[PDB]
Amino acid sequence: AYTTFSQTKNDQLKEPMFFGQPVNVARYDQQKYDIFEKLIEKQLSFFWRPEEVDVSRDRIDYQALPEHEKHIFISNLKYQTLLDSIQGRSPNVALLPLISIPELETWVETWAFSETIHSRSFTHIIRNIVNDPSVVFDDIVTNEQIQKRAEGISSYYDELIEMTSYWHLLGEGTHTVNGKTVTVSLRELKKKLYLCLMSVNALEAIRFYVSFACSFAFAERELMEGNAKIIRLIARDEALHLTGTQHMLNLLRSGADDPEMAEIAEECKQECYDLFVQAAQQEKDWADYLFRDGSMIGLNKDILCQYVEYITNIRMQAVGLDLPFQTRSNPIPWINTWLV
């Protein structure tokens, strides 16, 4: 029951962000929530092309890095590649089929699009510093350390996607699928969406910021400056992406949108807290991996783990969760110089 053009005229201004009547005409003259249009406009004015970034001296710098430092850099780069590959497609397949307001529909499309520009910039980098790009790309899928986080993130999307299909196809209630009985609940589906958004918020707000830290640590040493320029542009986008999921979440839990969402948000508090905390933990185990056999000027396991906690506190707070860490200061204040 999904349609690329719903034939019944409806007032999109009195429609919920999700689960209402699929958007028919895409208009931008009216806004239910000013944030989304503000984000689309911002994102469009931020438009950049990875190919235009000069990554010439970068091969030299990378080739000169000792092995563990190449390991730190490339592992970090494979993680960013893996995250943005998922973020390029997932928000379109997962959220797009559920959105009921035009401005949000376009924001999701604009947002997912910018991720593809991000994935393109990683290729531009990888196939410019490394000898055989295929070795790096293949490892993103076979490396157990990288895949350890991959399966958790996508799992949220995949579960939402499948539960969305049963809903669209069978609708609410119990149904007979090959003799089995299957229960499709819109309430459960709304939970899946809420949790997925929470997971996506942790990815852009925490996971990606941990990676920016390693990228900029090299930049501080005046190495990999082409990469630095790309990551700084990427970060400028992540700020916008993160803000969009923050607003979506806050609007949903504040009942200002779908009142049932406000309820669901509450039943979820623990799961959210736990998923955010689990993400932070995973980022700390990553720091162990990256720094297994050494650190470099400006970064080490301690510095990164503290940064992870610092950032986690701040993000969790922004979406109404309890701060899980005592940490209260930024150990890498220079990162703000890069961040925008």
Place this chain on the structure above:
Amino acid sequence: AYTTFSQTKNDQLKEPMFFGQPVNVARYDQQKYDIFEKLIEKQLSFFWRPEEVDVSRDRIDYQALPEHEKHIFISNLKYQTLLDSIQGRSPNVALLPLISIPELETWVETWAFSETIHSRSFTHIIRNIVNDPSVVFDDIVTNEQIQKRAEGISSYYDELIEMTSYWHLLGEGTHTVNGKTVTVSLRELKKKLYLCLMSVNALEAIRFYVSFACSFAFAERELMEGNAKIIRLIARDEALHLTGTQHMLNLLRSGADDPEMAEIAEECKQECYDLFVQAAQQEKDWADYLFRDGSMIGLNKDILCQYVEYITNIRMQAVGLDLPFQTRSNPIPWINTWLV
């Protein structure tokens, strides 16, 4: 069956364009078909913001047009808005979940994103020329003439989406949903995709070009110059869009990708032809509607219908279908001034 990140490592250069293993690493260092990467690069270089085009002087132009000409202009603009609304979401919702080639997945997302820019540009025009934009937007949905031209296009996408859904949720073979035995044939799915792509190609290659004629007719009279400038930018994107679908269809039907497709291509060459001829006929009825109260300098039902036939032969031949109309030189050669 769908996963936002397939954990199995595969050689992406030996996957079919569609239905293969879902895309995992988004890489652009290696292309199976150079056309797609070329199109991405071209679109990226074409980036424009509707918000930056001056549509001020258009309002006086529009308000000064006699009633029938306002009818011609606004009906054309509404049809354009309807088509880009569908084009904004559909490629993502329908083709995205079936692509198994990185460069292709990215092209569809780039393509769909440029469509949202087109939709935004229509809001920018509508707001700057009419009194109550809401009447215009509401009519796109309640108008039986406009909504008629949206039935066919949606159906193709909708049926593809729904079947794609069943396939992901039930795999192929015969199954039972609420006792009703429903069969899921991958071959029937591949046919729906093929027809959908043909419908899409007709949309961008013919339907849109028919609309550019009306818009540019006004520009020839030095009226609606702001809209003219936007339509030029859009036309320039449309070229890329149809090149995309022509190649998709030609590669599919050539067996150069998946053999089952090439077979399915010939299996439904008659439907494809009927589909295109039907599209041309609707654009002729549409031209009939546009001019039921008069025509203007440079364009009338006759001239417009000739152009539909002119453009249709060319497009049909490009995808290897038979030419259904007499031969003739471009009936409105002045449109070259505006094209590209």
